[PDB]
Amino acid sequence: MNGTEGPNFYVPFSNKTGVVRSPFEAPQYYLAEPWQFSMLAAYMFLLIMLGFPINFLTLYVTVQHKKLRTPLNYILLNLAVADLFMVFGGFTTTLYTSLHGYFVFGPTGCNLEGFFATLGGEIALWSLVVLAIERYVVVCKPMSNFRFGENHAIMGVAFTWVMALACAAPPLVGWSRYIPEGMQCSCGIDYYTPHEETNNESFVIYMFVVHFIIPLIVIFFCYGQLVFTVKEAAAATTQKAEKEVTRMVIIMVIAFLICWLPYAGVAFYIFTHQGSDFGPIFMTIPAFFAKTSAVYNPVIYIMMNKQFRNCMVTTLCCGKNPLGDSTTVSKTETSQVAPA
Ligand SMILES: *[C@@H]1O[C@H](CO)[C@@H](O[C@]2(O)O[C@H](CO)[C@@H](O[C@@]3(O)O[C@H](CO)[C@@H](O)[C@H](O)[C@@H]3O)[C@H](O)[C@H]2NC(C)=O)[C@H](O)[C@H]1NC(C)=O
Ligand SMILES: *[C@@H]1O[C@H](CO)[C@@H](O[C@]2(O)O[C@H](CO)[C@@H](O)[C@H](O)[C@H]2NC(C)=O)[C@H](O)[C@H]1NC(C)=O
Ligand SMILES: CCCCCCCCCO[C@@H]1O[C@H](CO)[C@@H](O)[C@H](O)[C@H]1O
Ligand SMILES: CCCCCCCCCO[C@@H]1O[C@H](CO)[C@@H](O)[C@H](O)[C@H]1O
Ligand SMILES: CCCCCCCCCO[C@@H]1O[C@H](CO)[C@@H](O)[C@H](O)[C@H]1O
Ligand SMILES: CCCCCCCCCO[C@@H]1O[C@H](CO)[C@@H](O)[C@H](O)[C@H]1O
Ligand SMILES: CCCCCCCCCO[C@@H]1O[C@H](CO)[C@@H](O)[C@H](O)[C@H]1O
Ligand SMILES: *C/C=C(C)/C=C\C=C(C)\C=C\C1=C(C)CCCC1(C)C
Ligand SMILES: *C(=O)CCCCCCCCCCCCCCC
Ligand SMILES: *C(=O)CCCCCCCCCCCCCCC
Ligand SMILES: [Hg+2]
Ligand SMILES: [Hg+2]
Ligand SMILES: [Hg+2]
Ligand SMILES: [Zn+2]
Ligand SMILES: [Zn+2]
Ligand SMILES: [Zn+2]
Ligand SMILES: [Zn+2]
């Protein structure tokens, strides 16, 4: 056999040398060198040191500036939060693991690690479907009359949390499960073994279809309609606003892919070629690289949303003077409404 199946794991290392051992009981240093682990540990340490402030600041600024209530500002508050969950929920355990060499906290540390990453990535995917719509109703405007009040914005955010849970919560209760991957420092869904005892085979399709293919077809086709109205470049007059938020909601989709396609791809490969011959390094790269999903969203936001960027500077400068190159929002300053 080219892997070592366990009742809890599956190390992608042969054990015709009795060197293999439970990623929940001893260092996996025979899978690679002790420094590559120190790399993962340094790398995660930086991810935590970065995703934390970026996401926390984002959260903070959104709430402090009382006029940042568009559905988009809503969605990003959501991501900023989900992201903070990953940071503490999972990255905490994935850092301690990479350090001490194995899932020293057993399956729990593994479900923390694995659960909070899925929760975080699916929330991002399902959020992208919300934006894919909120974006459809503003450009290819349907009803001769409509705009999303915070009313409907709190709807789509509550939604991404149901869908995300529908996908990440099951493995914690008996449908599929979180098992360590790569150098065994991160935990993912079970693609490795059939384990009829929990039905991993069923879930993995449930997930690849209900939580990957479909949201992707939705998000892709919806875009095919928004291929005339708001063309694709960038640089009333209130049209260059929604014509710009859109170019953002689109760079968010490129990024999601860049992040999960390589993982999802390797994950689907495994499922299809279970028990074949792959190494620990195989999935360690797309798995760990995807952990940057806990921080790129706010970066895109702060760079593609002139409005938020200044609101961020405004909070950071306590007062103002945001060296810009259009409307507003804040607190005791000009957070006054200007509707109709
Ligand atoms: C690869 O093959 C190895 C041997 O061929 C397996 O190693 C062991 O089976 O590991 C167990 C640990 O569970 C050892 O038995 C001990 O440790 O069991 C209890 C732990 O619950 C201890 O308290 C006792 O002291 C036992 O020694 C075995 O000694 C050891 N086998 C050997 C080297 O003879 C190894 O698990 C296997 N890899 C896999 C499939 O994970
Ligand atoms: C062990 O791993 C090897 C490497 O994949 C498996 O060999 C291989 O996959 O076998 C399939 C059919 O069984 C061939 O079509 C293919 O050519 C092989 N891959 C190569 C290029 O070596 C082998 O099947 C695995 N054994 C198991 C299931 O434990
Ligand atoms: C997408 C760029 C175009 C901006 C319009 C979309 C978001 C609408 C924000 O509306 C404002 O929300 C405030 C509460 O947050 C209300 O107090 C205020 O009366 C209302 O007018
Ligand atoms: C982190 C996410 C990475 C996404 C990077 C996306 C940047 C690619 C932008 O494309 C370019 O936009 C110009 C303006 O419209 C076009 O004139 C040009 O032909 C097109 O190639
Ligand atoms: C990590 C994600 C950040 C990468 C940014 C993705 C490339 C999109 C570039 O588009 C341009 O950005 C300018 C901001 O200076 C806008 O003023 C301009 O109208 C817009 O067309
Ligand atoms: C869009 C990015 C998605 C990435 C998906 C990558 C999955 C392809 C894996 O290929 C296989 O890897 C094995 C060991 O690594 C080789 O032994 C085998 O010959 C090779 O065919
Ligand atoms: C994205 C790259 C795809 C490659 C997938 C297989 C990589 C497996 C690497 O294995 C490791 O190589 C070290 C140096 O040879 C050995 O010391 C160690 O024991 C072995 O476990
Ligand atoms: C380091 C830990 C990781 C990456 C753990 C778990 C991730 C998943 C189970 C991923 C789910 C997927 C996402 C977020 C995006 C589309 C579908 C999917 C299965 C690839
Ligand atoms: C509200 O407006 C908050 C004030 C923001 C001021 C930020 C000052 C930055 C700190 C300067 C550090 C310079 C390097 C010092 C090295 C010893
Ligand atoms: C306004 O006074 C000029 C801006 C310079 C001060 C801003 C300091 C740099 C921002 C660093 C971000 C850290 C925020 C931490 C959030 C938890
Ligand atoms: Hg769209
Ligand atoms: Hg990314
Ligand atoms: Hg602002
Ligand atoms: Zn079992
Ligand atoms: Zn989901
Ligand atoms: Zn199978
Ligand atoms: Zn500016």
UniProtKB/Swiss-Prot annotation:
This is Rhodopsin. It is a multi-pass membrane protein. Zn(2+) binds at E201, Q274. The modification N6-(retinylidene)lysine is found at K291. Residues 325-340 are annotated as: Interaction with SAG. Changing E113Q: Causes shift to the activated conformation. Its main location: membrane. It comes from Bos taurus (Bovine). The modification Phosphoserine is found at S326, S330, S335. Phosphorylated on some or all of the serine and threonine residues present in the C-terminal region. Contains one covalently linked retinal chromophore. Upon light absorption, the covalently bound 11-cis-retinal is converted to all-trans-retinal. After hydrolysis of the Schiff base and release of the covalently bound all-trans-retinal, active rhodopsin is regenerated by binding of a fresh molecule of 11-cis-retinal. Changing N15D: Normal light absorption. The modification N-acetylmethionine is found at M1. GO terms for molecular function: 11-cis retinal binding; arrestin family protein binding; G protein-coupled photoreceptor activity; G-protein alpha-subunit binding; guanyl-nucleotide exchange factor activity; identical protein binding; opsin binding; zinc ion binding. One of its GO terms (cellular component) is outer membrane. Residues 62-73, 134-152, 225-247, 304-340 are cytoplasmic.
